[PDB]
Ligand code: HEM
Ligand code: HEM
Ligand code: HEM
């Protein structure tokens with residue numbers, strides 16, 4: 112219903128070259144820069160006064176590592192995305208109160224980061240594969256909301 | 258996806274009072290008046306130049322009747338919307354070239370029509386049930402696009 | 404932009420709303436929380452039960468702000484300046500949610516205005532709520 | 545609104561595109577048709593095959609329009625008047641599709657401008673494309 116075998120292979124191969132902590136810190140930082148309203152959950156993270164401040168903020172980087180690490184572990188279960196992220200869905204809805212729209216935006220920022228990081232290697236077909244992935248992850252994270 | 262039993266009862270009970278032919282014409286006509294761009298799929302229907310012309314256009318009323326009739330039949334298969342609309346999904350993509358984003362707008366317009374026609378009886382909980390339904394039908398109708 | 408006909412339709416429709424604006428405001432919020440659960444993520448500090456005084460109070464402010472917007476339809480950005488500041492820098496509601504509430508406000512008006520919610524008025528009201536939304540998110544970045 | 549920094553950021557990044565206008569435009573279109581298939585419903589009779597002259601030609605028109613907008617960032621509504629008439633009255637592309645194309649254009653620029661695509665420029669380019677999209681859908685209704 113989503114990824115074809117060639118698409119899964121493409122996602123897996125590219126991801127095998129990703130510095131998860133690095134991409135995570137960068138995607139979260141970019142999310143907070145490009146869509147500043149997402150800063151609302153991180154006032155306790157300190158300085159987010161400018162883009163350089165956000166990107167250089169240690170707590171923003173720390174959080175991006177956590178977020179992308181859980182995203183990365185989920186790429187090993189592209190056949191059970193809803194189940195894989197169920198407990199994080201409940202958590203984000205029941206305790207964190209994070210609007211699922213934020214997952215969709217982070218998803219697209221991740222795609223822009225991957226395109227910036229990999230250049231031409233991030234071909235249109237590879238992008239389409241990753242678009243299904245970020246949409247699936249975002250849908251799975253939003254599934255337990257009530 | 259996944260209406261509760263109370264929602265299912267609410268959906269069925271309200272629909273027993275709907276004049277499918279008329280409500281369909283009203284919803285399709287409003288879709289064309291409120292979101293004018295949707296008129297480009299009805300190039301051959303005649304006068305759509307003004308609100309009164311759209312709302313009184315017989316081909317619009319007739320088509321609204323066919324459209325809502327298919328939605329109506331789907332109400333009998335709420336647990337299998339994708340399978341129920343697979344054939345029409347393909348038709349709408351391969352032959353009609355209709356952007357599925359319009360299915361969502363029509364669903365919202367139908368909700369406004371039911372609210373306008375039924376008044377107070379279209380309570381917040383009945384609305385919520387119908388919101389689940391219309392998104393499920395829109396999703397089912399967009400499912401076979403490629 | 405809002406045409407002379409749209410502004411006329413809006414004023415007439417909201418004029419019929421009259422003193423019920425606050426009650427309709429709270430109903431629109433209730434409709435929103437039940438129809439689009441994710442919107443509740445912005446009010447974890449609220450009792451969101453049917454009849455809730457918190458929802459009634461908030462509904463009253465939302466309605467009053469729109470009444471003020473209608474009264475300044477030709478000069479809307481300034482009338483809503485403080486609310487734009489507030490939503491852009493404190494509340495930080497993702498833009499998509501304004502579309503959910505606008506839709507629920509339309510549904511609320513439709514359920515209460517059998518006579519005035521004509522196709523033309525529906526169109527004008529939708530444009531009006533979209534412009535209010537645009538204004539309220541105009542300082543986001 | 546596009547701030548002075550946004551405009552500076554946009555002019556510099558887009559300036560870098562230069563001669564690759566039609567190439568980047570075609571690639572953004574291909575990225576959209578592949579990632580978001582529903583967008584192909586607006587090009588039902590187009591030869592959408594990889595490297596097709598039709599997509600290359602349309603990509604170039606799209607990028608030249610963007611170049612025109614950047615050159616007149618201070619007054620886009622006027623600079624894109626004909627284009628907004630066309631999209632509003634003839635093409636009638638549902639508004640959501642502009643976000644899809646804008647995202648693919650951003651992805652395209654990211655993949656081709658390693659040096660220039662900083663977080664700040666990323667934000668400015670996103671604001672710019674949203675602003676162009678708003679202008680192109682301003683006469684819809
Ligand atoms: C790919 C999407 C995402 C994944 C898989 C993810 C994953 C995680 C994980 C693994 C945690 C740790 C929770 C714990 O320690 O029990 C977490 C916490 C959290 N997440 Fe998400 N998340 C995602 C996106 C987001 C976004 C977009 C936001 C909001 C902009 C967000 C806001 C939070 C917050 C506020 C916390 C609490 C952190 C703290 O208390 O220090 N998350 N997330
Ligand atoms: C609840 C969602 C919808 C349902 C269930 C539905 C159902 C149908 C059905 C049953 C037909 C009859 C086909 C035939 O007899 O051959 C049809 C045709 C058509 N539909 Fe849909 N439809 C939906 C929404 C829409 C929307 C929102 C648009 C466009 C904005 C659209 C545009 C059309 C067009 C252009 C035709 C062909 C009309 C003609 O030339 O006769 N439909 N649809
Ligand atoms: C028609 C669009 C809207 C209007 C006119 C509006 C107006 C306002 C007003 C007047 C207030 C009170 C300001 C004050 O106390 O100083 C407010 C507060 C707030 N609004 Fe918005 N709003 C709108 C849409 C939204 C949406 C879509 C959401 C999120 C779903 C949202 C969430 C809130 C929140 C969380 C508060 C704080 C409530 C409290 O703590 O009492 N608003 N809004």
Ligand code: HEM
Nearest residue numbers: 583586587602605606609610627635637641642645676677
């Ligand atoms: C950044 C946004 C966009 C820009 C700058 C843009 C620009 C243009 C221009 C310059 C033309 C050529 C007009 C002429 O021949 O004089 C055009 C045509 C067209 N556009 Fe748009 N456009 C945008 C987005 C969209 C979107 C999102 C869609 C649909 C997914 C779309 C679908 C079309 C179609 C179908 C045509 C007609 C092509 C043909 O028949 O040759 N456009 N656009």
